[PDB]
């Protein structure tokens, strides 16, 4: 995240770092079985690491859970990242608890000028790498689709929103995929992709999540 804020330990609750030996992507707990994260972020190997701040200190409130089985979704397409959501199910059932929660999924999709939080433990440079050991947090609002796909001709779809400032200064960046995009209490979002990180008029591209309630609520009850 680059241009945002210390978050503040176990104040986002639901968020979670997918290991597979160090930190390479972000998730979210939808329920104490489950986790939503993006498909690029797919790999074998995977433990989810619940509770966390600082994922380079054992700080006493995390949990650390193998994944059982992932789920990629059937229409995901590695070239224009269209259809970036996979799902994590976990060996066991986390422990929910003031530090772990879950995320509520959306009843209905959100519209462009809604702000929404965004975490992760992703590089916080536009120009440069630093990668921080503390999650950080931004706020940023949903764009309208129009400013979107001017800044990405022919490469947006309908599973896909930007969120962030066209001014640039403010976005999510690598490190931060696979995690969440919460406006107004529900998930909205999943960090995809983008253009660099905080450049002018290249704001962040996030996976839809309100298109794919129905295919998560059926897939996590029939595994
Ligand atoms: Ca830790
Ligand atoms: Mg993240």
């Not at 609750?13 to 972000?26: D, K, R």
Request: glycine share 12%; with cysteine; aromatic share 8%.
């Amino acid at each position: 995240i680059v241009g945002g804020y210390t978050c503040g330990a176990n104040t986002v609750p639901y968020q979670v770092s997918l290991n597979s030996g160090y930190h390479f992507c972000g998730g979210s707990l939808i329920n104490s079985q489950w986790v939503v994260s993006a498909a690029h972020c797919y790999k074998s190997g995977i433990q989810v690491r619940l509770g966390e701040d600082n994922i380079n200190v054992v700080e006493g409130n995390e949990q650390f859970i193998s994944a059982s089985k992932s789920i990629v979704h059937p229409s995901y397409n590695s070239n224009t990242l269209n259809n970036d959501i996979m799902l994590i199910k976990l060996k066991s059932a986390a422990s929910l608890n003031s530090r772990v929660a879950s995320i509520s999924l959306p009843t209905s999709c959100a519209s462009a000028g809604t702000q929404c939080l965004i975490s992760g433990w992703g590089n916080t440079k536009s120009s440069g790498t630093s990668y921080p050991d503390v999650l950080k947090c931004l706020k940023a609002p949903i764009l309208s689709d129009s400013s979107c796909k001017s800044a990405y001709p022919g490469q947006i779809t309908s599973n896909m929103f930007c969120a962030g400032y066209l001014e640039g200064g403010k976005d999510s960046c690598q490190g931060d995929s696979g995690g969440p995009v919460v406006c107004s209490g529900k998930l909205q979002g999943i960090v995809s992709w983008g253009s660099g990180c905080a450049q002018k008029n290249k704001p962040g591209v996030y996976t839809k999540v309100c298109n794919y309630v129905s295919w998560i609520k059926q897939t996590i009850a029939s595994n």
